[PDB]
Ligand SMILES: *[C@@H]1CC(=O)N(C)C1=O
């Protein structure tokens with residue numbers, strides 16, 4: 001049971017999440033922190049999550065924009081969640097390919 005931290009906007013000043021791709025075990029915590037070049041948000045698409053479950057995507061996505069620095073959003077992948085690859089993106093910076101992927105390992 002750990003806690004992974006992802007910065008919304010690279011310290012370099014690029015429009016990415018870092019680390020972009022992550023690998024976690026069930027029970028772990030993911031914490032996005034507002035870093036460089038806000039505003040950001042976190043969206044999963046209908047058919048990017050395991051099973052393409054719309055309700056799932058909408059349960060995880062923080063559709064609301066975050067503006068102040070240090071502002072954070074947390075998801076804990078308890079046993080409740082299925083395994084596979086969850087793919088997410090910042091909506092304002094979709095064009096610039098601000099994209100990340102979390103894989104749930106076994
Ligand atoms: C993406 C998946 C879907 O069916 N809708 C309505 C989306 O926004």
Ligand SMILES: [Cu+2]
Nearest residue numbers: 040090093098
């Ligand atoms: Cu962004």
